[PDB]
Each structure stands twice: as structure tokens, then as C-alpha cells.
Design a protein around this nucleic acid. Sequence first.
RNA 1: AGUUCUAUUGUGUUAGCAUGGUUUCG
Lengths: 129, 32, 71, 92, 335, 22, 159, 4, 24, 134
Amino acid sequence: MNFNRIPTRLSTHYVCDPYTTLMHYRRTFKFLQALKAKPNCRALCLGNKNQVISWPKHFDGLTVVTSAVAAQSSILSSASVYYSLIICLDPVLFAKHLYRINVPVLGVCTPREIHEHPEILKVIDYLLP
Amino acid sequence: XXXXXXXXXXXXXXXXXXXXXXXXXXXXXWXX
Amino acid sequence: RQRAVLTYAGFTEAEKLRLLDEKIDMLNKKLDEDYELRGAPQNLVYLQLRDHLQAAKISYREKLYVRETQK
Amino acid sequence: MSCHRHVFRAAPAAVFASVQRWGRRNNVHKLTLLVQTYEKPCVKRTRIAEEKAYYPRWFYLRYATEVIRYSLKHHLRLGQALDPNDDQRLDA
Amino acid sequence: SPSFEQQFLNDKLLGQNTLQFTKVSEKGTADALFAECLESIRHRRFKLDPDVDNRSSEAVEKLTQEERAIAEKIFQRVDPERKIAPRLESRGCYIDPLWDPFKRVEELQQQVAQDLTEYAKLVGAAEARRQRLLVRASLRRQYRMHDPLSEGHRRFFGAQRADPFPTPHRVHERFWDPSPDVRVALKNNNVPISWRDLHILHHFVGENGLILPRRTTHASRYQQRCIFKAICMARRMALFPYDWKPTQGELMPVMDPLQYLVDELTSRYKATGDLRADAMLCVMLSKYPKLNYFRYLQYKAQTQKSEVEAMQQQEEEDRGDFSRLLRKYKRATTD
Amino acid sequence: RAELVAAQVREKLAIKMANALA
Amino acid sequence: KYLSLTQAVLKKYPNMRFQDCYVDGNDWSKGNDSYRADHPVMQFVALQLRLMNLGLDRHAAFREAEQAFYARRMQLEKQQKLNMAAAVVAAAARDPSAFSVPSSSLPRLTAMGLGDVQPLFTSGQAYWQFEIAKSQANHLLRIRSVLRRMKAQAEAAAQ
Amino acid sequence: VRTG
Amino acid sequence: LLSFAERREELAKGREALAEKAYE
Amino acid sequence: MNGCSKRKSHRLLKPVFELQQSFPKIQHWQGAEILHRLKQKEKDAAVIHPCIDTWGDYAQCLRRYPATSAARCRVESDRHTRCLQQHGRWKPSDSLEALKLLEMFKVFNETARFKYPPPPVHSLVRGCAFPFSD
RNA sequence: AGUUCUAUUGUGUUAGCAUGGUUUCG
């Protein structure tokens, strides 16, 4: 059934180990509690159509770039006016757009994704395994 | 008879180990 | 002859004696019922089985007495 | 050697086709063309390098096309990565 | 009262394979007497047997074709040098004797024989012969469907052959998988191949006469070089062809023909037990005492020792069932 | 509407007799 | 280290590849031998490596794992024997006599393991031969039933 | 579940 | 095979079925 | 009683559209040419109809032989009957080219004139703004 | 790394040989 290379080395995942996950939960709980302790603050949630139909495909943050000259422009540029926290479920897909975003980002992803694209740690601020 | 059934059950319980080998695995059946 | 010995090896002497007596009693009841229904059975299956079991029990009693004398 | 085929309860065209297949898989025509004319050693080096680079690609693409045809014939669906930790338990 | 073997096992297919279910004991032994008593009682109970005991269910495909393919691959991996087969003679190794499912088959054959003889007694000999012929025909029809991994089973159940998913023709050496015969040929006898091994060089040469490549022969690089050298030397010595596979008369290894004959007769007497081969080896032992009969003599000694051990065991059992058979379980487990 | 009651009555009798025999 | 431990255990016990042979994840083809974490091979190598970490040699850990899984096999075998003992009475409930002497051999067939509950073996050879024996017995049963039906018809015609 |  | 306690529970469910579905 | 306790999900029992062997990425145009050669050697039967050629041959033979056609045209008649029986309910194939199917698997190597499309974002982005306070 | 031995040699020089394209003879 398989006719490919068989790896000999397995890499551990310290970022998503039990104690690291517990610390992630502890550190994110305080920030979430402090954010909710303040009024009139909205949280955006981003995911993929294949991991969520009912959810709207267009929101205030979305920019919907349509021109070739605007390809480099981010699509979540204006999310900072409306939202105080972006909960992302597809950091690999949204990495180029969450880079240097002016609102805190809480990313949910798998150890495989983290290891295959470690650059997502430069766009994620809080991690929930 | 209930006692005859008990004797048959005792014989089936104090029986050999199915497979004659002393291996370290029980195999299910893939027939049917 | 080996299969019966292997199957009954786990059974202790007392348990085997109880089972033999139970089989003798069941054969007696079955033969009485057959006589009541017909009187003269058309087959001697249970008759021969009961005869063999009784002979075996008598021989086993004699063997136990022989063991007693040996001790 | 010389391939021998017996035309018995079959078509002479079919037997000729089988002989052609034997010749092609043995490269008989290739060798005949090679020996019909002089090939300089450098030309032979280049040709052998080209063949050794080319044919494995052809074999892999042949395997790929065979898989494509089988999947189209049997109406097979694209696979999804096997999610680990799935109990794989019968719903019975 | 003809038995099942007396009635139906004289046919070609039916008589080919005939397993043994019980040890054979000579007349005049406790085992023989107990067997006689059991046979008589079983026949009488077959007379006084009910209808529910002969209920049978319809036959269905035991395995799918893909599952059969998977099972065949796994059995081959279990025994990569030998061919997969239901070695019902070696059955005792895999299934404990006390849990043999063939006792039911033996008793059913006895019951069928008793039924046929009683039918002959009642209706008539001509009708009995008609029914025996019909039962023979039915057994012949159902002979090849019992094995779930055979082609007879597929043909009987009318199942189309599986269409396996395509696999690559050019794969890595890690995955090359030779057949058992090619595997045995390549391994030889743990000895590197020489030109004298004319009985095997035909495997690695194509019908065209060209020596086969390593991707086709599934040989190591060293083995490939050794085989190439052996074939070249044999060709130069004119004992191996140049443009075709060797004729069936060229397959003798380069060695003494009488030693080859001794080897072949030993192989026959071990695999099947040809009494003619045994007699030929017996006469050769004295006529040509310069050959090697070690394996034949060793097998003869093993058989004689096993016979003596069996006789001693029978004597012990006659005196009273001793601890040998009990040990064969308890001591074996303790070890 | 009658087959179900018949079948479950048979099941009741079988279960009762099996329990008694055991 | 599993790459070598699995090879060792498979070479010692080739029959472990039958287990979960139809389950996606266990690739038993030559050159792979990659099983799921819940496969007996994976459990064996995991236990062996755990004992090695605890500080035993490879061979000692191998023997300890073998003993542990033999004990597990014995437990499952005894559970199956209990199920067969239950099935003995379950089938005996079908005898009209119970509803003196039994009037059927079905309890004895169940005891021998040909009834509702069938035995568990260590190798696939055993299941192959078991299925062959089952098919042969069923064909003989059909023949015997037909013969006895003809017997009854002949008796009725004669009377 | 039985043996796996 | 089902244990005796589960057999008793199934018998109780069957008794409830007798009370409700069959008689009424 | 004893039997498999897990689903028979093995990809051999349930073949799936996948390439079970990987291979070093091939130049796109070289792979395209090889696939074209394979298709030409296979002679993909996308003709007007399989039966059209048999009917044409039968009609031509009948026209050539207006008198002894009954005996002359029998191989053609049998061939046309077979073609009608086999490809009578024939529908032209509607599937993607193997070239595109393999671009999906990423078998080929990006050249100057071929690049894999970037992951879609506009179609796949799903946003859900909800209140989070108090 | 080096020296000695060990198992293996599509390496280089070697007397001869088996086979073969080609030409040749009838």
C-alpha cells in the first residue's frame, strides 16, 4: 500500500505538551477575563468553510481585494476598529494577513501545523492547543 | 439435565489452551 | 481412550463418582419410562450404557478397596 | 533469440501483433538501427545519459495514468488523511 | 456395513486426501476394545437420533475476494519460503487435538455410512447403488468449494475475480517481493551460486536467452554478480544454452549422477514415501557404498526410534495411562 | 399488532424456562 | 527504536499481522510493517521500551512483554470459555426433554466449540482449517438430512 | 474489543 | 452472552410491555 | 462469535483515488508530453461513436458487393452486432485530463511558465463577529 | 590515518576461449 521513504526520526512537540498546554490555558484565562471585565468589546472569530455554511462569509473586517495591484494588501486591515480579539482557527491560511495585526490574536492549531509552519508563532499571540 | 450441563461446562472449563502454542497473542477470525 | 482421559483429567475422583452415580440414576429413570411407554425397548442403547456404568462403578469400588488393603 | 509463435485457433494478425510486442519489449529494432550505422562514443554517452534520465519518469507517469483510469472506472473518491485516535469501532 | 472410506473414498478426487482422525490400534488392545464399544454405542444412538441434529445451513461466501487476497498475502509473509496450503496433516501443530473440529466430520461420515447401509437394507441394493452414485456425484461437486482461499470456492459461489488497485512496476528495492520458488533459488543452500548449479540458472534467464536484470530477479548485487559469472562459465563449458532456456534434460547439477539419483529418491521417500524409492536406495546402499546416504539413513533411524517410543507408550498405557501424555501439556507449559 | 405479542410471549416463556433450568 | 523492535517481534511471531488486517492504518506489506498504536505489535514494543527505560536489557524486556501478553491471552481465553459454558445452557434450553436424558447433541457440540460460541486461536492457519472443517461438516449434514428424509418417505410409502 |  | 441480571432486566421490560401494549 | 471488532476500512478493501508512490517532481512540460504519448498510445475512444465506424464499414462493404453481400458481408455484420451490443448505450466521457488530475496531486515541478495556484482565501474565509463583554 | 592477517572482488596488466556483427567459401 506504501512505496515511499520510511522516516527514522520523530520530533517531539514541547509547545503542545501537557504542562505547556496547562500554562497556555492559565495565561490565556487571565487575558480573556480582563478583556471581558471591560464593556463594549467584540471578538472576531475566523475559520475555514470546511471546519465550521451558517457562518457568514462576509463581515466588517473583510476587505475583499479585487485588483491585481492590491494583491499584497491584507484583508483584515480594518478589523482593529471593531474587534479587540481575533480567535483564529486557520493560522496557516491567514498567516500573511494576521502578520503585525494591531489586535491580539488567539490561535488554535495542531502540533503538526506548528512544526510544519513555525512562522505562525510570529502572528499568534496566544495559543490554545 | 442441569447437572449434565454443569459437567459439560466443567469439562469445557478445565480444558486445553485452544492453540497448542505458547505464543503471546490471541487472533480473531476474519472468515465470514 | 486418550481423549476421555484428557477431558476428565481435571475432574477429581469424588466429582467423577458423583457424575457416574447421577448418570446411573438418569439411565434408571429413562429405562423405567421406556418400559412404561413400551415395556420391551426396541433398542438396547441405554440398557447397555447402564450395564457398563454399573460394572465400572463396581470395579472402581473394588479398586478402592484394593488400595485400602495396600495401604 | 528468435521468438517462435504457433498460429493455432487464433488469428495470424494476433500472432503477428504478439511478435511485434516481443520485438518492442526486447528493443530488437533499436539495436538493428544502432548497428546499421556508426555511433561515436560521445554520442553514445549522451544517448545513454538521456535514456537513464528519461525512462523512470515515463514509468512513474504510466503508473499514475493506470491509477487514474482505475479510479475513473470504479468511481473512486479522493482520499482524506487518516485522522489518528479514531476508535475504528463497528457501529454494532 | 461398509464405512465412508469403503464407500466413497475410492474415487479419484475423494480418495486423494484422506485425513486420519483417530490412532490405529491393533486388535486385542484396550484402545481397540474401547473403540469397538464407542462405535457400537454411536451406531445405536444414530439409530435413536432425532431430526434436529441433522439441521444444515445454506453455504455462503466465507470471504470477499479482496479479503481473500489480504489473507493470502499475510499467509505468504508468515511462510515466505513455502506455499500456503491447508496442511490438515500438520493440523495438530496449529489446533490442539482436544479442540479438533474434524471429529464432527468423522462422526458425520460414520452416520452417513450407517444411513446408506440401512437404506440398502430397506429399499433394495439397486436403489442403494443409485443413491451411492448420487452421493459420489455430490461429493465430487462439493470437493473444491471447502477451501475459502481456493479458486474452486470462487467458482462454486460465482464470485467475480477481484480487480486489484494498480501498483508501480518500478519500486524501491525495499519493496521487491520475489515468489517462494525464486526465493529458494536465490538463497540456494546458504552457499553462493556457482556454474555447477545448472538446476537453477534457468530462473534468471529470459525466454529470449538474455540474463534477467536485478529488478526482475530480486537478487542482491553480490548474488547477481555470482549468477552472471556462473551462467557465463556454464555457457563457455557448453552445458547451458546461449539463446533459450535449458531443455528439461539439461537440469541436472554438475555432480555425480548416482548421487543425484540418491538425493532424488530420498526426496521422494520423505515427501511422499515411495516404497520403490526406498527399495532402490536400499539396494544402492550396498551396490554403490561410495555415495552419501546420511539424510536417508537419519530419516530411517528417526522413524525407527519413533516407532519404538510409540510402542513403549502403548505398553505404558496398557499398564495404565501414565504421566507422559499429561506431561506433554503440563511439563511443556512449565518449561 | 398480534405478531409482536406472540413473539414476545414466546420470548417470555423461553426466558422463564431457561432461568428455571439454570 | 520501534523500527527495529517491531521487526524483531514480527520475525519471532509472524502471526501478529493477522490482527486488524482489514483496518486502515496497519500497513503489513513487505518493506513497511507500520501498525497503528492500538495494534498488538505496537503495544508489545511500547511495553518493551517502557521496561527498557525502567532499566532492563532488550532481551529481558522482550521476555517480560511476552509473559505479560501471554497472561492477557490466558485471561481472554478463560473469558471465552465462560461464554461457551453459558452457551451450553443456552442451547440446552432448546431440548424438549428439559421442557430426563437430553434429546439432542447440540449441548455437546457447543461444549466441543462447534456451537454458538467458537474458540480463539493464535494463528490464521487454525481459522483456515476450522472454516474448512465447518464447511465439510455442513455438507455432510445436508446429505444426512436428505438421506433421512428419503428414509421417512420410503417408510411412509411402504406403510 | 474482544481481542484487539 | 447476556448475564443473568441483564436477562432479568429484559424480562422486566417484557412484563411492562405485557402490561401496556398487549393487554391494553 | 469471535470476529473482527473494527471497521473493514483498509484502503485495499476500499480503494481510494490516490498515488501510493511518490517520485521526484518532474518538469511540467516533460510530464505533459509523456502523458500525451500515453493517451495517444491508448487511443482514447472519444470518436463520434464506436458504432459509427462499424456501420460505415458495413455500408461500404454492402455498396461494394450489391449481389453477393449476403455471403460476403458476415465478418462485418458480426463486428457491427458486437459493437451495437457493447457500446450501444455509449456516452462520451466527462472527466478532467490526467494532466490536471496530477497537478492536483502536485506531481510536477514548477517551471518558469507553470506555477501552482496560491491557496484560496476569499472563498474559504468565514468570519463570525460576536459580542464578548460583561 | 598507517602495518599484518582475514572475506570479497564489473580496478590495471595478462598466455590462451566461448560467442557474435561483417567479409569470405560452396
